[PDB]
A paper describes a structure:
PIs, such as darunavir (DRV; previously known as TMC114), suppress HIV-1 replication by inhibiting the functions of the viral protease (PR). DRV is a second-generation HIV-1 PI and is one of the most potent anti-HIV-1 drugs, owing to its high antiviral activity and high genetic barrier to the generation of resistant viruses. The latest International AIDS Society (IAS)-USA panel list shows 11 mutations associated with DRV resistance: V11I, V32I, L33F, I47V, I50V, I54M/L, T74P, L76V, I84V, and L89V.
To investigate the mechanism underlying the DRV resistance of FS5929R1, we determined the crystal structure of the ligand-free state of the inactive FS5929R1 PR homodimer at a 1.8 Å resolution. The solved high-resolution crystal structure of the viral PR exhibited a unique curling conformation at the flap regions (residues 43–58) that was not found in the previously reported PR structures. The flap tip that are around the 50th residue curled inward in our crystal structure, whereas the 80s loops were slightly shifted inside of the PR. Therefore, the flap tips approached the 80s loop within the same monomer. Interestingly, the regions included the two major DRV resistance mutations (I47V and I50V) and one minor mutation (V32I), which were induced by the in vitro selection. Because the FS5929R1 PR harbored the major mutation I50V, which was absent in the other two PRs, the unique flap conformation is likely attributable to I50V. The curled flap conformations in the FS5929R1 PR might hinder the DRV access to the active site of dimeric PR because the flap tips tended to curl toward the active site. The high mobility of the flaps of the FS5929R1 PR would provide little opportunity for the formation of PI-binding pockets, resulting in reduced opportunity to bind to DRV.
Numbering used by the authors:
A (entry chain B), B (entry chain A): 1 to 99
Amino acid sequence: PQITLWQRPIITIKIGGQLKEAILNTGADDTIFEEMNLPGRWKPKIVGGVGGLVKVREYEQIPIEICGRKVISTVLIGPTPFNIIGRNVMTQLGCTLNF
Amino acid sequence: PQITLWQRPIITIKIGGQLKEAILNTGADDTIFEEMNLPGRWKPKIVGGVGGLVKVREYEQIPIEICGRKVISTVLIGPTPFNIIGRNVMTQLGCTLNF
Ligand SMILES: [Cl-]
Ligand SMILES: [Cl-]
Ligand SMILES: [Cl-]
């Protein structure tokens, strides 16, 4: 699809089988969601996204469906004021900014 | 142009007569640069560049040249860890996200 930027680009996606809102954030290197359960194993990680260092849980191999497309991705769970889809997933999606 | 997201989408732009690096950030409502002296007058504004709430200088009608395109825009000057082109500018350029 083609997402306009008149509004915040917040879409409903299905992440690890659950429906969530998230913003497509080209300023974000990684994908980070607020506390929720994801399937499988995780490892703790320190990241700098995006207001101080934070400890997050990193889950690899997470199925995400976004606007009809399915990817398998690394997702961080921790303190974030918004759920954020970042460039790691956007690259997997083939997403570009076009003008 | 078509900007891919394998790396941070940082571009060199011309803003108020100066060349600056900035990141194309679909997660940012507004366009904010670090301390710079822009042309014209400004008014104080609070914004949630978190950061917590930060006081910024708001400049209106600032010319911006980005990849050969010229726009006249509102720019915030204040604390920000990077110079950010946000959606206000992107919409003026006709930017979309596409996958
Ligand atoms: Cl949600
Ligand atoms: Cl710069
Ligand atoms: Cl204000």
